[PDB]
Amino acid sequence: ASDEPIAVIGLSCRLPKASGPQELWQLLDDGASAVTRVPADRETARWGGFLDRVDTFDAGFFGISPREAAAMDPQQRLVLELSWEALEGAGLVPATLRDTGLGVFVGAARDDYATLYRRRVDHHAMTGLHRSLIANRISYALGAHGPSMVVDTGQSSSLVAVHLACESLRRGESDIALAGGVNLNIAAESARETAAFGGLSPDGQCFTFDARANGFVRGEGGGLVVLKTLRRALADGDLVHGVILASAVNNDGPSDTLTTPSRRAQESLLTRVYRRAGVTPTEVGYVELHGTGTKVGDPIEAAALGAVLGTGRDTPLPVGSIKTNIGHLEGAAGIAGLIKALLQLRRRRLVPSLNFSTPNPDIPLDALNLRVQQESAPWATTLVAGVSSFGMGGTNCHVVVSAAPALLPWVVSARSPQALRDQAGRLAAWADSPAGREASPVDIGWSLATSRTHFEYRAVVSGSDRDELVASLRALASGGRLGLVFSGQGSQRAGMGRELYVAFPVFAEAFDEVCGVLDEVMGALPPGSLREVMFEVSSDLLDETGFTQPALFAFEVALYRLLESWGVAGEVVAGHSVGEIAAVHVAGVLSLADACALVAARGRLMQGLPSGGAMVAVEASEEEVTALLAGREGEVGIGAVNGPRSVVVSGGVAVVEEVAAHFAGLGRRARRLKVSHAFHSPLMDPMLEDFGRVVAGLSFAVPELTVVSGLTGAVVSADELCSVGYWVRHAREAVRFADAVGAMAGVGVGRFVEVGPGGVLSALVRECLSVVAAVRGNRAEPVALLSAVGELFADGYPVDWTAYFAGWPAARVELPTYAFQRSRHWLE
Amino acid sequence: ASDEPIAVIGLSCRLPKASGPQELWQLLDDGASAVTRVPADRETARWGGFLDRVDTFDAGFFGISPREAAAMDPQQRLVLELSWEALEGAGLVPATLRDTGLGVFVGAARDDYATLYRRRVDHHAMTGLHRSLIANRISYALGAHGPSMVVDTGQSSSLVAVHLACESLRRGESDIALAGGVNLNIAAESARETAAFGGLSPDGQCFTFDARANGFVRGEGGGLVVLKTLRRALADGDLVHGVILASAVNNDGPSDTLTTPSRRAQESLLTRVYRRAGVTPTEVGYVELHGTGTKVGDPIEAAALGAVLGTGRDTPLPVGSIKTNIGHLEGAAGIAGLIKALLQLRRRRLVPSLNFSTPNPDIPLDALNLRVQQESAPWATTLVAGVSSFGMGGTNCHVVVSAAPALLPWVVSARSPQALRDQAGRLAAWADSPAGREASPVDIGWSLATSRTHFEYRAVVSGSDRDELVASLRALASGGRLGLVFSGQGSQRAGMGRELYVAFPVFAEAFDEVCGVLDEVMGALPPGSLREVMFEVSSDLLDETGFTQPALFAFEVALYRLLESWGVAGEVVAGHSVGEIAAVHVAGVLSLADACALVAARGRLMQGLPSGGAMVAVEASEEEVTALLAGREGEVGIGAVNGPRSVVVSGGVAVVEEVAAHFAGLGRRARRLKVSHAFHSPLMDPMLEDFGRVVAGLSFAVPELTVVSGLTGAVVSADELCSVGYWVRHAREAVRFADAVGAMAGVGVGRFVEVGPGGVLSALVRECLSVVAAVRGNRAEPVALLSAVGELFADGYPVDWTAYFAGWPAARVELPTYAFQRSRHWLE
């Protein structure tokens, strides 16, 4: 190919009885006609291809006041809609194009709405009724700096728009291009002007190449293609819908009449454009005609396609015209023709040209070697199509297009709760439809995650099959710094991490690495496979602290690595007792080796202490409990200050039972905690000095995150944190968790996530103050985690959903476009 | 320069108080304002730059019916006019562009006339009111096959049109391009829409960069430039008016408001376009602003030209805006700005920007390093200018333009006697004006001859100085096969060819070559310098036939070579007696050597015969004279049958005097011819056999033209013509000249030219039947010849006037454009 072939990487279209590409396929393939009488709500030649309506537009979506919407050419309104839908169609997130060199090239040859406005004034009229802003408004809304223009060559405007975009891309003037056109028939005055010309079929049909040929029927609509160089297309890994090899535009020059087309000029345009692409009469699979159905214009266009592509061909050449389905869209005729050919090329199937029975007696189809496509068939032999579009003032354009070279989240967002509902439902319908079933649930979710604006109102639905997700959608249609708090002893439960292991490789890999180290450490000095202990439901081994502490650490670090791989990065971390070892390690203070040495030792040295230990949760203030225990320092102390009326008392089971009895006798809650020992009491004094010797052998680095101490109840710096005195004291004195939550909030934490099993810490964080428990109980682990990272994403946290789909080899696929909240806007 | 620089090789403009480029210079240089109140004949913000009128158009010139003219957007009408004037301005003859790849690119952003039509229907409305035909109609009229489009970027449309033409030329899509725009303010509805926007100065002035800045004043008009690649420009030897180095167009992207311009986007457009041309802040001589005079838009455009061209410059940069003279032409604003800069570049002088007194307090001119041009000065240092044009919808365009790297006929033609008159007068005014005086009479005539359509009504004026030609113009404002008949004995006069020798080198050269041979031939066997004999007025030597015959031959062959060098090529030739030797030689039958040998011999062998010879011209039929001379064959015969009542009797002076007496006695004309001998009588019998021996030594080739015999009275073929019998008989028997004219006419000759001195043969050709004598008497030879070739050109003969100007080194120079016969066309 001479010059850089251009990639159609997307498209949109509003056509008669075809609100999108899918519907346009249904219509064309069913061999259906959207030509009707003029709707009663239009003014009134009595025939035409009309949109279901031209008055409705989501002005708010594009930041347009109702009064500006009223004053705006519905052509401007529609092209905005089509622009957004073309980008979404291609997979590009429009915000990423802000300040890029995106070009806008639109064929517009009519200003009907300006006629309605003028035959009946505020600052709005100027921009609303001026044709230039059909392109310019697209450019202003996307914030694009590329060239932005409307072109008027009449009934060839929309294809010439495409040509100027291809050349624009070739010259590097623009990196991406929106091209096509728009034509709305919303004034009788233009209906009467084209009627008086003599161009209109009294029967209201384009009899394209048929012998009934007696004029064209009018149609209205718009189409846009998304254009990138083929090079840049493949590089950026974008859905390639088809490729423009060569575009050309000439003029009739010296025709018989101004309005008569010239056979010479059409041959000269064909010969040139094909030679630039290097395509012979035999390599062209199908030609999408102008084919207006005019007595004069049909034979000339036939004769010209004959001479160039009829000679040098054994088979007849298939020809058709979307003007037989939707009428003559004039300025938008060519982008209509191109968008058909592009669908015929992706589907690899031809569709019928309607209104053909007997051939025109001025068009020998046999001699010229062209056959009119009359049925939906498959397309034989890559596949190559040609598109013609001619203007009455003589300016012809042709384009040569070739075919292209366990638990899932679906994320949905909108600019409005009502849009989000509508967005959810539109995806359910599509997902559960034939066309959505050529796409896997995997592929869909990946496409939802990467290729779609995350608007201000967001939901996540989850499911294991399509039926489950579609069900969740239908149901849906009816911040600060991120703080992590790592769970302590009490939060453990048999099964811990089995369901997360089977589900997520990133958890399983990290869980295997942390268990591999721990199985060596514990295997050497046991209280030997920790995974088997944790994952077995028939086992109470985890209630024994020589297993509980390494188990909580293993589950918490796996979970942290899984969260981190989804972009859920804590900035500030705190831990309840053994929680702090997981927290401190992932803040990079201890290597995995030292962390495993530290936690396993702690587990063991405490495990080997005698019975006679107890802890009780008590509904009382710190000040109350200090008064009740003053003088008993040697037998009992405060194990935890968890809330302002939430402290755990720990020590001799004798004096604990007494304390539990006292607060119950005051009509307070008092729950006996299931634990082997009196943690954070004087009963820990025996193991302390042995614990101090294990930590004195470890290497403490400065943290990569802000650590808040469960001992200090405040932000803890490295010098304190990287000493032996801290970790012995940590093992012995009260967990100041309530105070830790305060210090986190004080330092700017707005979102709190419990990193551990259950929601013990989340409850205590709630009592102290946005709190979510990463893995709440009474539901499968994958469900409870996805739920939790869901709330975070909905509240505005930038979850990296892309990274959730590293496990699978998910491919981008076309999705429904934004469910516009259209409302009526019109003159009075 | 990155991409192929483009040559502006021509331009036209209709602007307020500036009907052409010359007037636009006068206005700009006088520092004049064409802003006025709305004329009373317009509908009605109360201020504007208006054309003297927008209703008048020569529809017939462009083959448009008055009814189609009525229905036509005056924008369409004006751009047709401007198209023809742009081509004529560049020197290109529009008929030569028929079927070439000429591109038409026009900025048009308004359809006012469609508003007038619709607020009040035939087949005419469709093409007349559709914007696309502003470009397409140009394309149809010129018969051009290049791309033909209107573009709408709003108030930047006309410069973007230029850009798309430059890129079109660079890609070889078009070989020549018409680019610019048009904007006519002929509807109140658009006046009220821009008023309500808030953009309009209540004072009705663009106070460009002045502190009174309070909006723009509207203006109307159009401009076109003629564009060719610089390569093709120099090659084809075309007037280069200036050269576009680099054109760029972008869009504001994310501006504060849709309609607010962005400083960022303007910097990005400037940086790019200049870098493509390779021009530094210091190489730019002047910048032609957008400079609307808006409070918001002036500072932003200033700030952006500052940042790019203000830094890196020791001197301030001169800036101005034609919007201070003619108002804001909107869609035609940019081509207005470009056409100024192009005139500043040819004149090598700056002009003032009006309405500047005190600088805007939001525009530090010192800091930004821009000074507003306030006076007409010279332009210091080749010269380089920049043109800005911005649209309200954000689409900016900039262009970088550099400065360029004895008796005369004036030919004038028109499509109408009234146009020819008007055409003649418009050239007289211009010729005799200062601007026409920078062009020599030579240069003018060459330009008239080569660079101007030869329309169906044509005149030639002649003169020796400008005063004489301008006088001839003012006076002017108050076919078949071409046959040559070569003069015989009787037509000679003393001076013969002296005035033609001094005048035309091609005659003089050929006269010297024919005399050089003859002076040898005659010098050897004399009856010795033939030029001296012929050119002397005090000499009767030429009445002696030994001189007369070579003299007629020498003058006739020189004249034939002069005629041939002007493209006045005879297809059929005849000669009276010695005439036939010149005729036969130039038909290539005899070489110059043999022709000179033949004629000189003939001259001599006849010269040496005795006295007693006479000839008399007689007003009588051949049949009458045969009856009167029957029986006297030995003493007298018919010397010539010249007309149907015109024969010359020749022989013994005794019997001739008798014949002269007889016809006088019958009351008939009878003129005694002044001759030495009785030519074509029995008195020639003595020299015949000696004549036969000279011709028998000569080489006769087949003629390259049709020869008609004065002996045969019919078309003579080579076998007869290339024999000795023919030329002896030719010398002896009657000249059947009347019959020769008949045979010429019979074989299709419609134009007859006497090749010889005087008009003896022309009279006889008139009597027999378009007849012109190449050199009639009683007037200087150059005058009488130019007159004669004038009549031929007027009657439709393709005279090659180009070839008349090989003598001088004449250069093409700009001329007045076609004097359109404008009449009113409008709606009712």
Ligand SMILES: CC(=O)NCCNC(=O)C[N+](=O)[O-]
């Ligand atoms: C002379 C006449 O009525 N020609 C109509 C044929 N023109 C065409 O087919 C191009 N077009 O206006 O869509």
Ligand SMILES: CC(=O)NCCNC(=O)C[N+](=O)[O-]
């Ligand atoms: C916001 C506003 O009224 N802006 C006017 C400034 N715009 C310009 O100068 C570009 N133009 O419409 O010729």
